[PDB]
């Protein structure tokens, strides 16, 4: 099966999202000031009616909790970034898993 | 149009101080990290300093660290380079540039010369066209712009009316620590003695302007 | 500190040819290399960064490759306007350092120089110095040798020369050599000569004058 | 590696009580251990923080990295009234979280 | 202790109606689904009805659907079974039970008899000990509890003072549609003629109470 | 509807023995089967549900197994109190249906019945009916035949019998048989007899009386 790509489709999909560090106030990052990062959102499994209270109670116990499949990245990519470190030096560093390439259900 | 314009360069004695400015326009200055980079007389490129978009973060090579300070005024769209305890090896053309992964839209530069030698205007001598210039051929004439300091000098011919066939050579640094250069022009031999040829020499560092008429020798 | 080495200080090419410039880092710098182009009388312009990324507005003919220590800058088909000095730079770790540059010249047919000798002016002589000037005008290739001779005696170490950048229109070079003597030394001799050796001259060309005449 | 079990990325206990939920159409089980997954997955690079933060503001259900979620689940046989006044014994899949892990 | 107590059973004519009640104690009644189950005269068990803990959901077999209604009053801790259009085959002991996956803590039941026959108290006759009972041996005597309707009947001996060696048999349904049972006791032959033996018969459906002295003839 | 079949209506065991009772569903019912125990004069009690799950407080000796159509209820080691009728039930789909039950009895030594005959009472005779009663007391095994004879003529269709449940203390059965005649028929004959056949007896035993003697 293929990963799905969306914009502004109800199944687990990859949506666009651009991170802007300069707008975030993080000027210690020289480059990239902006990059396509993206995210995963959407439906996974048919939800049995009997499962609803479980899903509902889990959310009330912890909104970050998961009691079933998760729509989440299945492929991610790094980015090479240029930034000031803590010793007044500038570093080119490969930061892993910065870009969402594909989404899928766990 | 993206434009960076450096200023404030000049002749300074070793141990001295100088502050360079860089006027930025044509882009959102406050969103860009900025850098200073210099080009030595040997044409070697050397990174000097980098400052974050907001101004909080700075970085320098050890060659200038503790002597140079990069700063900026975002409200004034200006980048600065405060230099102190100046050394002979700081002599260079100083460029300001926008900083991304690499330096872009570098300005045209401001020249900094570090020396204890005094400013000296040039002597301008004629390079007279040969009396043996081929009848209906080509003749050469020019001006020798000798013993000046610091760089630069500009030379024009006939107040800018003569530009074709002109060669203004790079200056040579003589054993005296003074510069010298020649500016030549090739013209038809048939023009000699009717067309006047004047080299206009300007040495802005000493505020000296010389117009020398160049003619066949009597 | 990281050292960037460009082994070719000079490269000669024809229009339409493929040009490749190498840059070696003294340490692994991943893909953190930029390439700049510097034309005469201008500041350097950014072409590539992160080894292969073209800066905004840079023509398709310019590419870059490499990872780790060995980097290559390529001009797929050389245009006359590509006459420039190309520099590499690592943007991996501060202090950022540059390569020594590679000058790219445009090839053309051999052109012998037109030679001219200029005696010192009477004005300059009044102050105690004599500058004798030899001009080699509009020649190709760059390699040329000027030998100063005073009463047929070879001069050594008392001359300096300067060469113009390759002309944008005719692709030639010009050269000016100045022989500097004290007035006392100048007045002791008669024949002042400049002898020019160049590929376009089957035999060396001598231009001379007799002091006073 | 083993899945982790926690109390008061880990598996936390949670008991579903249908009768307390007001769902008397389910006869049995009235209560069952269902559980859930919560906790940390990968070392979080400082540079990744704005991505995580912006994703949450765009959609709180969104994911831009590993998810602490079930890796093993079990069904339950339930007894319930259907829509035609009959009572059914039906195997309902993925009702119990057995183990948690990072995607 | 969890306890369920059924009541309301009795004799009803075919086509008639009857409402059964079940009193619940010793547990949270409102938290349990509940059921009715019956046991026929052949001892066959048959599910009758089920109701959800809250009362909204009900289920019935087609045998009673449309005639029987299960309901509950959580405030009164009571389960009900309203029966109507009663049929001969509805004759059974009716049990209420708590419902989980299966039925638990069944009550002791309430008897429902569906017939056009009228209530009839029994005739009680002696089963006199034989004059040939072996001296120093064992003798038997008893009471014949004949021609009553509907069930049940209870029998005791000497107001409960005699229980050892008593056998009270299951009633037989005679061809007349009336029940008959015997209750016997074995005693030492030497006790006959000194010890009085009385069977106490109670037929609650007709409010008949009979004490019959049983002696050698 | 789903039919539940318990092929064995009666099973005889000794204390300490293993007893297995089978139940067959006419359709697949997954594991949705319950087992109940019914002791004399009591309502059924739940033992197992969902084929193998013991209800709260049920002894370890009771187990259940099966999935689909074939189910088994096991008593690992029979105890005296296990004398009961065991029923299976499917709780898979409504209408819920029960098996026909399996009665489990305990074995003991053979005990011949003690036999007694009772003439009709004079009170009953006044009303036009004669009930003659034969009692078979405390016997084992259950198999017993009662034959009524009137003036040595074998009776048929005019008697009914009932048997008690196996005694909790001595493990025996008792049986009562009633012969019903009109008073007119009763007065036409002299000798009233009960003939009992049981494995414990030396040979069939007859108990009799002569009417009016």
Contact, E87 vs E114, CB < 8 A?
yes
Candidates D62, D68, D99: best to mutate against A (most CBs of A within 10 A) is D62
> What are the C-alpha distances in Å from B144 to residues B121, B127, B172, C133?
13, 7, 12, 9
Peptide bond into A2 cis (omega under 30): no
Kind plus residue range of the DSSP H or E element containing C184: helix C183-187
C17 HSE (CA, 13 A, CB side): 14
Assess whether chains A and D touch, using the rule of 3 or more C-beta pairs within 8 angstroms: yes
Cβ–Cβ below 8 Å for E167 and F120 = no
Torsion angles phi and psi, residue B29, rounded to 5: -55, -45
Neighbours of D, requiring at least 3 CB pairs below 8 Å, are: A, E, F
CA triple E186-E189-E190, angle to 5 deg: 130
The reply to whether C120 and C178 lie within a common domain is yes
**B136 forms bridges with which residues in the sheet?**
none
Cβ pair F51, F68 in contact under 8 A: no
Helix (H, G, I), strand (E, B) or coil at F122: helix
Contact B78, B34 (CB under 8 A): no
How many domains in chain F? 2
List CB contacts (< 8 A) between E59 and chain D: 81, 85-87
Q: Under an 8 A CB cutoff, do D54 and A29 touch?
A: no
> Are residues C89 and C97 in contact, defined by beta-carbon separation less than 8 angstroms?
yes
- CA dist list (Å): B64 to B37, B61, B84, C95, E217: 12, 6, 9, 11, 141
Cβ contacts (< 8 Å) between E169 and chain F: which residues? 162-164, 174, 176
Which H or E run includes A22? helix A21-24
User: Which residues lie across from A25 on neighbouring strands?
Assistant: none
DSSP code of C168?
T
Q: Count H helices and E strands in chain E, helices first.
A: 0, 19
Max distance between CA atoms of chain A, in angstroms, equals 58
Minimal C-alpha gap between E97 and chain D (Å) = 14
Nearest to E108 among F43, F133, F180 (CB): F43
Name C200's Cβ contacts closer than 8 Å, sequence gap at least 6.
Answer: C110, C111, C112, C113, C139, C140
Domain of residue F188, CATH code: 2.60.40.10
Q: Please state, in angstroms and rounded to a whole number, the distance separating the CA atoms of residues F134 and F166.
A: 19
Same domain, F115 and F212: yes
Q: Tell the burial category of E32 from Cβ atoms under 10 Å away from its Cβ (0-12, 13-18, 19+).
A: buried
**How far apart are the C-alpha atoms of A79 and A98, rounded to whole Å?**
6
Q: Residue E217 burial by CB count (10 A; 0-12/13-18/19+): exposed, middle or buried?
A: exposed
**Dihedral angle, C-alpha B62, B64, B67, B69, nearest 10 °:** -100
Subunits in contact with chain C (3 or more CB pairs closer than 8 Å): A, B
Quick check: D69 and A66 CB within 8 A? yes
CB proximity F31 to D under 8 Å: yes
Quote the CA–CA distance of C186 and E212 in Å, as a whole number.
Answer: 175
Kind of pairing between the strands at D4-5 and D10-12? parallel
Phi, psi (deg, nearest 5) at residue C187: -75, -15
Across the interface, whether the CB atoms of C91 and A92 are under 8 A apart is answered yes
- Which candidate, B35, B37, B38, B27, places its Cα nearest to that of B77? B27
Cβ-count burial F108-147 (b if 16+ within 10 Å, e if not)? eeebbbbbbbbbbbeebbeeebbbbbbbbbbbbbeebebb
B81: Cα separation from own chain's centroid: 18
How far is Cα C146 from Cα D57, in angstroms, rounded to an integer? 75
User: By the CB < 8 Å criterion, does F89 face chain E?
Assistant: yes
Widest distance between CA atoms in chain D:
58
Yes or no, beta carbons of F94 and E123 under 8 Å apart: no
Length of chain C: 213
* Residues of chain B with C-beta less than 8 angstroms from the C-beta of C162: 169-172, 181-182
C73 and C172 belong to one structural domain: no
Chains A and B form CB pairs within 8 A to the count of 36
Give whole-number Cα distances, C60 to A10, C45, D62, in Å.
41, 16, 39
Residue E190 three-state SS: helix
Angle, vertex CA D12, rays to CA D7 and CA D15, nearest 5 = 100
Do the chains contact at A30 and B60, CB–CB below 8 Å? no
Q: Is C157 on the interface with B (CB under 8 A)?
A: no
Q: Is the separation of the CB atoms in F103 and F9 below 8 Å?
A: yes
Apex C92 CA angle, C86 and C97, nearest 5 = 45
Q: Which of B31, B57, B101 is closest, CB to CB, to A84?
A: B57
Q: Hey, are the CB atoms on C94 and B61 less than 8 Å from each other? A: yes
| Spatial CB neighbours of C133, under 8 Å, sequence gap ≥ 6 | B127, B142, B144, B182, C117, C118, C176, C177, C178, C179
* Secondary structure (DSSP) of A23-69: HHT-TTEEE-SEEE--EEE-B-S---GGGHHHHHHHHHH-TT-BSS-
**Shortest CA gap A97–chain B (Å):** 20
Query: CB of A31 within 8 Å of any CB in chain B?
Result: yes
H or E stretch covering D78: strand D68-81
* Residues C133 and C176: beta-carbon distance below 8 Å: yes
| Same domain? C133 vs C177 | yes
SS3 E134: coil
User: Are the C-beta atoms of residues C135 and C194 closer than 8 Å to each other?
Assistant: no
Q: How many whole angstroms from its chain centre is CA B126?
A: 24
D contact test, residue of E57, E58, E98 with most D CBs within 10 A: E57
Q: Domain check: are C113 and C43 in the same one?
A: no
As a whole number of angstroms, the distance between CA B130 and CA C122 comes to 15
Distances (CA, A) of C84 to B43, C36, C143, E52: 13, 10, 19, 90
SS3 C117: strand
Q: Which of D43, D55, D66, D68 to mutate to test the interface with A (most CBs of A within 10 A)?
A: D55
DSSP D54: H
Find which of A15, A36, A67, A100 to mutate to test the D interface (most D CBs within 10 Å of its CB): A67
Indicate the residue of B109, B144, B167 with minimum beta-carbon distance to C164.
Answer: B167
- Distance between CA atoms of E77 and E65, rounded to whole angstroms? 24
Count Cβ atoms within 10 A of the Cβ of residue F24 and give its class: 0-12 exposed, 13-18 middle, 19 or more buried: middle
Fold of A1-106: 2.10.90
Please check whether residue E49 is in contact with residue E81, taking contact to mean a CB–CB distance below 8 angstroms.
yes
D81 reaches E (C-beta below 8 A)? yes
What is the β-pairing status of strands E138-148 and E123-127? antiparallel
DSSP one-letter code for C92: S
Top CATH class, D1-103 = mainly beta
3-state SS, residue E16 = coil
Do F83 and F151 share a structural domain? no
Q: Contact partners of A by the rule of 3+ C-beta pairs under 8 A?
A: B, C, D
Q: Determined by which method?
A: X-ray
- Spatial separation of the C-alpha atoms in residues C197 and D6, rounded to whole Å: 90
Resolution in A: 1.8
Query: What is the rounded distance in angstroms from the CA atom of residue E169 to the CA atom of residue E173?
Result: 12
Give, for E208, the enclosing helix (H) or strand (E): strand E208-213
Q: Is the dihedral of CA E131, E135, E140, E143 positive or negative?
A: positive
Min distance D30 CA to chain E CA atoms (Å): 8
Is residue E214 a contact partner of residue E158, using CB atoms and an 8 Å limit?
no
Residues F142 and F210 in one domain: yes
Looking at the fold, whether C117 and C179 belong to one and the same domain comes out as yes
Q: Does B130 touch chain C (CB under 8 A)?
A: yes
CB contact (8 A) between residue A92 and residue C94? no
Backbone torsions φ then ψ of F82, nearest 5 degrees: -80, 0
Contact: D77, F30; criterion CB under 8 Å: yes
> What is the longest distance spanned by two Cα atoms in chain E?
70
Strands (E), chain C: 4-5, 10-13, 19-25, 33-38, 45-49, 53-54, 62-67, 70-75, 84-90, 97-98, 102-106, 114-118, 129-139, 144-150, 153-154, 159-163, 173-182, 191-198, 205-210
Last residue of a domain, one of F108, F123, F152: F108
Could you tell me how many residues make up chain F? Answer: 213
- Cβ atoms of F62 and F79 within 8 Å: the answer is no
Answer whether C touches F (≥3 Cβ pairs < 8 Å).
no
Cβ–Cβ under 8 Å, residues E210 and E192: no
Residues in chain F with CB shorter than 8 Å from the CB of D89 are 29-30, 32, 91-93
Q: How far apart are CA D101 and CA D99, in angstroms?
A: 7
The helix, strand and coil proportions of chain A, stated in percent and rounded to the nearest 5, come to 15, 45, 35
Classify D48 as helix, strand or coil.
helix
The D residues from 54 to 83 touching F (CB cutoff 8 Å) are 77, 79
Determine the residue of chain A that is closest to B34 in CA distance: A30
What is the separation, in whole angstroms, between the first and last Cα of chain A?
Answer: 14
Domains of chain E as residue ranges with CATH: 1-116 (2.60.40.10), 117-217 (2.60.40.10)
> What is the pairing mode between strands B92-99 and B33-39?
antiparallel
Structure letter (DSSP) for residue E206? G
d(CA F128, CA D17): 69
Count the Cβ atoms, other than its own, within 10 Å of residue E105. 19
E183 at D interface, C-beta within 8 A = no
Q: Give the Cα separation of E89 and E69 in Å (integer).
A: 17
Give the CA dihedral A53, A55, A57, A62, nearest 10 degrees: 180
Domain that holds residue C119: 109-213
CA C54/CA B193 separation, integer angstroms: 55
Task: Looking at the structure, tell me whether residues F52 and F151 fall in a common domain.
Answer: no
Q: Return the C-alpha torsion angle E3, E170, E178, E130, nearest 10.
A: -140
F29: Cβ–Cβ under 8 A, 6 or more apart, which residues? D89, F2, F68, F69, F90, F92, F93
* Cβ-count burial D8-32 (b if 16+ within 10 Å, e if not): ebebbebebebbeeebbbbbbbbeb
């Amino acid at each position: 099966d293929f990963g799905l790509d969306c914009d502004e489709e109800s199944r687990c999909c990859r949506y666009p999202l651009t991170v802007d560090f300069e707008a975030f106030g993080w000027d210690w990052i020289i480059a990239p000031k902006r990059y396509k990062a993206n995210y995963c959102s959407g439906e996974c499994e048919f939800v049995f009616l009997q499962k609803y209270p479980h899903t509902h109670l889990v959310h009330q116990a912890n909104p970050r909790g998961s009691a079933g499949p998760c729509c989440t990245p299945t492929k991610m990519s790094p980015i090479n970034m240029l930034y000031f470190n803590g010793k007044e030096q500038i570093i080119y560093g490969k930061i892993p898993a910065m870009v969402v390439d594909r989404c899928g259900c766990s | 149009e993206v434009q960076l314009v450096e200023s404030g360069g000049g002749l300074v004695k070793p141990g001295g101080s100088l502050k360079l400015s860089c006027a930025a326009s044509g882009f959102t200055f406050s969103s860009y990290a900025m850098s200073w980079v210099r080009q030595t007389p040997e044409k070697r490129l050397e990174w000097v300093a980098t400052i974050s978009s907001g101004g909080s973060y700075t970085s320098y090579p050890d060659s200038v660290k503790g002597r140079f300070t990069i700063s900026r005024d975002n409200a004034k769209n200006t980048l600065y380079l405060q230099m102190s305890s100046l050394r002979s090896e700081d002599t260079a053309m100083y460029y300001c540039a926008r900083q991304d992964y690499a330096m872009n839209y570098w300005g045209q530069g401001t020249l900094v010369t570090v020396s204890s030698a005094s400013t000296k205007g040039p002597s301008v001598f004629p390079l007279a066209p040969s009396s043996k210039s081929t009848s209906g051929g080509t003749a050469a004439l020019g001006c020798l712009v000798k013993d000046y300091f610091p760089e630069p000098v500009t030379v024009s011919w006939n107040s800018g009316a003569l530009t074709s066939g002109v060669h203004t050579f790079p200056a040579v640094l003589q054993s005296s620590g003074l510069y010298s250069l020649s500016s030549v022009v090739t013209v038809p031999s048939s023009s000699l003695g009717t067309q006047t040829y004047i080299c206009n020499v300007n040495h802005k560092p000493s505020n000296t302007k010389v117009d020398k008429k160049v003619e066949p020798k009597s | 500190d990281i050292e960037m080495t460009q082994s070719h200080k000079f490269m000669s090419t024809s229009v339409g040819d493929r040009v490749s410039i190498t840059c070696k880092a003294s340490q692994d710098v991943s893909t953190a290399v930029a390439w700049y182009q510097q034309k005469p009388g201008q500041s350097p312009k950014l072409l590539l960064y992160s080894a292969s990324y073209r800066y905004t507005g840079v023509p398709d003919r310019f590419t870059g490759s490499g990872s780790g220590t060995d980097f290559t800058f390529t001009i797929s088909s050389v245009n006359a306007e590509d006459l420039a000095v190309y520099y590499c730079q690592q943007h991996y770790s501060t202090p950022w350092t540059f390569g020594g540059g590679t000058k790219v010249e445009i090839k053309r047919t051999v052109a012998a120089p037109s030679v001219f000798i200029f005696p010192p002016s009477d004005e300059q002589l009044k102050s105690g110095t004599a500058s004798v000037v030899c001009l080699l005008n509009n020649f190709y290739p760059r390699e040329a040798k000027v030998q100063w001779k005073v009463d047929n005696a070879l001069q050594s170490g008392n001359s300096q020369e300067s060469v113009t950048e390759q002309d944008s229109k005719d692709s030639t070079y010009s050269l000016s050599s100045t022989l500097t003597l004290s007035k006392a030394d100048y007045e002791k001799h008669k024949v002042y000569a400049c002898e020019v050796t160049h590929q376009g001259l089957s035999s060396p060309v001598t231009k001379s004058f007799n002091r006073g005449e």
